């Protein structure tokens, strides 16, 4: 970070702040809630456009005292109009800009926006679910305004979760009622308001699409996976993530009490004793010190968050994950829905800044044990076998003598990204209806329209397009600018809202309707499939071999003598 990235992200903050209110109209308008009535108000965009903004409705019990750590309860009726018209406040956090912890435990809110609360027809939903790691991340139009998809005709629905230790504390003691993935619970409970309210919002209960982007992707899946959402929406959209991606869970039952002896516990470990003392810390204490739980050792085998979504050590009426997600998936409703995926053309460009802090990260390529799949790896990773699995790796990005910071970043895109999306494709074709999957690849750079995660990644001024680069086209964030209609970045942000909703519509991503998708066939990948096929999109639309399948088969390779695993 700077004191200059520090100073003017608050007076774009002040421009935000400004903006807001410059773009708002005086009408004001109320709606129905099956908790009782909600008072949203009209907004502008740059783009001229108009919509109706529904802020702040809870969908649950604020998580505070007794309740937190605890799975979310249905929120409290009320007579008379709850103000919606302006948002509440984010999870509680460490502000990835200025480093201090900022938010709030009341949190549990959605966002619901459309340009015409009285549609002449009951329109798709879509449903946004952010990433950031399961640690960071809000529904605040500053990040995620809707202001380019409600150009369509559909309500967009933006919800936030409980985030870190306060989403995902999970103690193995029954008595105590903290299983687990509270912050995945959230996302039921906000899913399941949507279901039975978003019909007085003008859109279809039974056309609703769930998507999300990183953490978001993950947790869209895992509402694809878990029984206690069978049937609440009808298509899935994963971007850059899913629920078997080697990030996206961990076993984290330990981590409480650690969690609680860096806050100051004194006494045994006891998860009674641990879970009285968390449940008294102040929260900004708890989320800073967030960062210093992992171990050494699980910071070298790639976990990448200390509290997260678990498989939960014992059933509940509430239960998520009752097991490992590749076990969920066999069995999975959302296996039965048309589904969405895809990555970008640089994913791993994203690991810059982490990279630049850590170079000696780029050592880890001379012979890529500590990249083989955990599961396939000793211990130590010392073994022979781990030596060859990883000269695969190797031998699939290192291009000279020396591994390069870009080898790094390269293995990066398939770690985390492309090989888990391919062990998901193999194992769903092994349980699934026959409903189709289509792949996307997002390969449009710009430098003249960007989002906040560029300066995260510091790729100020890089060239690819990297993990959580397709946002820009997605969503107005504090840093867009009015693009001329004619521009290339003005034309993806048609196309990209435009096939989304389409897909969000039919099921099927293709539309004639799309500029540049004349020529474009796009159909869905199958079992018999030796090479993935997907829409590349770049400043021309064009169906192609995925490009990193080489890549991906020479990461399946280490699975030769371990069938069974992959
Ligand atoms: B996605 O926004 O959920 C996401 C974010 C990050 O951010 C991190 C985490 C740890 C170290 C560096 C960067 C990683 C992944 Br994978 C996915």
């Excluded at 992200?9 to 002040?14: G, H, L, Q």
């Excluded at 380019?148 to 005709?153: A, L």
């Excluded at 299983?179 to 209960?205: E, T």
């Excluded at 796009?522 to 990193?548: A, F, Q, R």
Aim: hydrophobic share 35%; charged share 25%; proline share 5%.
């Amino acid at each position: 970070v700077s004191l200059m990235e520090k100073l003017k992200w608050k007076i774009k903050c002040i421009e935000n702040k400004f903006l807001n209110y410059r773009l708002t109209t005086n009408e004001t308008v109320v709606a129905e809630t099956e908790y009782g009535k909600v008072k949203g108000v009209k907004r502008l965009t740059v783009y001229d456009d108009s919509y109706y903004s529904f802020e702040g409705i809870p969908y649950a019990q604020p998580p505070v005292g007794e309740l937190r750590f605890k799975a979310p309860q249905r929120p409290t009726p009320w007579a008379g109009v709850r103000d919606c018209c302006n948002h509440k406040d984010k999870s509680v956090q460490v502000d990835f800009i200025t480093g201090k912890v900022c938010g709030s435990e009341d949190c549990l809110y959605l966002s619901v926006y459309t340009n015409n609360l009285n549609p002449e027809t009951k329109r798709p939903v879509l449903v946004y679910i952010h990433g950031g790691d399961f640690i960071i991340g809000e529904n605040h139009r500053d990040m995620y305004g809707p202001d380019y998809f409600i150009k369509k005709d559909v309500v967009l629905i933006n919800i936030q979760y409980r985030l870190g230790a306060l989403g995902f504390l999970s103690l193995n003691s029954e008595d105590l009622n903290v299983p687990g993935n509270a912050g995945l619970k959230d996302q039921v409970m906000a899913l399941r308001w949507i279901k039975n309210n978003c019909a007085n919002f003008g859109g279809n209960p039974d056309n609703i699409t769930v998507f999300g982007e990183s953490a978001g992707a993950a947790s869209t899946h895992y509402m694809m996976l878990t029984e206690q959402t069978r049937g609440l929406f009808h298509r899935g959209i994963l971007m850059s993530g899913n629920a078997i991606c080697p990030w996206a869970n961990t076993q984290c039952q330990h981590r409480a009490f650690t969690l609680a002896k860096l806050a100051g516990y004194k006494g045994e470990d006891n998860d009674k004793d641990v879970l009285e003392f968390l449940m008294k810390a102040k929260p900004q204490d708890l989320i800073k010190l967030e960062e210093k739980v992992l171990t050494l050792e699980e910071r070298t085998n790639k976990v990448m968050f200390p509290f997260g979504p678990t498989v939960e050590p014992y059933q509940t009426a509430d239960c998520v994950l009752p097991k490992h997600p590749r076990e969920m998936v066999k069995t999975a409703w959302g296996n039965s829905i048309p589904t969405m995926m895809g990555n970008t053309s640089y994913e791993g460009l994203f690991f810059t800044s982490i990279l630049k802090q850590m170079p000696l990260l780029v050592k880890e390529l001379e012979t890529c044990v500590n990249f083989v799949p955990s599961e396939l790896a000793d211990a130590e990773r010392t073994a022979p076998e781990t030596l060859e699995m990883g000269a695969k790796i190797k031998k699939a990005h290192v291009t000279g003598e020396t591994p390069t910071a870009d080898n790094f970043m390269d293995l990066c895109s398939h770690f985390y990204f492309w090989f888990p999306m391919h062990r998901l494709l193999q194992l769903r074709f092994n349980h699934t209806s026959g409903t189709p999957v289509y792949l996307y690849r997002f390969d449009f750079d710009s430098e003249d329209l960007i989002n906040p995660y560029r300066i995260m990644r510091s790729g100020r001024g890089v060239k690819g397009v990297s993990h959580t680069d397709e946002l820009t086209y997605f969503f107005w964030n504090q840093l867009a600018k009015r693009m001329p209609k004619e521009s290339r970045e003005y034309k993806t942000i048609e196309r990209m809202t435009g096939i989304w909703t389409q897909f969000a519509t039919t099921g099927n991503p293709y539309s004639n309707e799309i500029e540049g998708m004349e020529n474009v066939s796009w159909d869905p990948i199958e079992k018999s499939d030796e090479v993935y096929k997907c829409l590349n999109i770049s400043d021309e639309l064009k169906m192609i071999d995925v490009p990193e399948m080489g890549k991906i088969k020479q990461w399946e390779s280490m699975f030769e003598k371990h069938r069974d695993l992959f």
